[PDB]
Amino acid sequence: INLPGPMSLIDNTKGQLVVNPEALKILSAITQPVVVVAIVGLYRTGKSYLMNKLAGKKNGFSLGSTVKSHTKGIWMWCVPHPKKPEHTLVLLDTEGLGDIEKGDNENDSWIFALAILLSSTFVYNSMGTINQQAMDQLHYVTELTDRIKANSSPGNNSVDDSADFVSFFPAFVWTLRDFTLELEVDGEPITADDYLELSLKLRKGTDKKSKSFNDPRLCIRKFFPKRKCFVFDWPAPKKYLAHLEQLKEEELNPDFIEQVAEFCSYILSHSNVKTLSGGIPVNGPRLESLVLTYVNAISSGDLPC
Ligand SMILES: Nc1nc2c(ncn2[C@@H]2O[C@H](COP(=O)(O)OP(=O)(O)O)[C@@H](O)[C@H]2O)c(=O)[nH]1
DSSP states (O other), X not given: OOOOOOEEEEEOTTSSOEEOHHXXXXXXXXXXXXXXXXXXXXXXXXXXXXXHHHHTOSSOOOHHHHSOXXXXXXXXXXXXXXXXXXXXXXXXXXXXXXXXXXXXXXXXXXXXXHHHHHOSXXXXXXXXXXXXHHHHHHHHHHHXXXXXXXXXXXXXXXXXXXXXXXXXXXXXXXXXXXXXXXXXXXXXXXXXXXXXXXXXXOOSSOOTTTTTTHHHHHHHHHHOOSEEEEEOOOSSOGGGGGGGGGSOGGGSOHXXXXXXXXXXXXXXXXXXXXXXXXXXXXXXXXXXXXXXXXXXXXXXXXXXX
């Protein structure tokens, strides 16, 4: 109808971070309540492919093919909510997450915390089994988000252990890609949610370097008390992964088809209308005011995030 295709919301393509006045203009005109889904993860891990499946439209995001490996940004695509009439689904696709283990450039990395704080549901996307690097990566953006939260008006006086925090801050979904691991414990099979809870399991009482072990896991667990995990096989034999989008659905792996259907159905039925601290529903212009408020507080701010 009137909602256009993906556009930059904020990126650093040409020098420094710039907010796209055209993206605010689009948000300003979205009078309907919005459901906001943000996705964060390393370059070319299939983030855009998955967000395009949520939108159910052609000509969606292609960040892995058109953004350079060093750019950071948030890209926005608003569509009618595929399952909730008179609701708009706001898709926030991001790029430029750095690998902390390799000392990747962290300048402007606060925009990934921004994407999380704008979201109804935050999707963290990584390849393979849950390993130390993926955990450390998640821990970094969680600490950054908590820092920005603790120090800005939208998040002020909303302690992580309260019920307001649990209810009105973003739900969390970890998507694991090219995942071939057997979801088994002692011959007995376990779910992907089970796998995630196991990876976040706390050492019970253990203390010398056991309560050091719990610290990053407790940070994640308490910042994201609403958690879900989805696993995705290779989409298709590697031969064909160059341009997955061009493949016909019947040429995908059948388990991948089911795994994408499951993810999409969960997100589109379970992600709530974005809400402020306190429960106030958020619509287009209200989201735009959140963007402005955060960007100004972080720009004008004194301390590092
Ligand atoms: N191996 C693998 N490749 C994928 C998957 N999804 C997409 N790709 C390919 O990975 C590349 C980058 O995709 P894109 O979605 O743009 O990645 P983004 O950077 O994370 O957004 C493309 O060539 C895709 O065809 C996946 O699940 N597994």
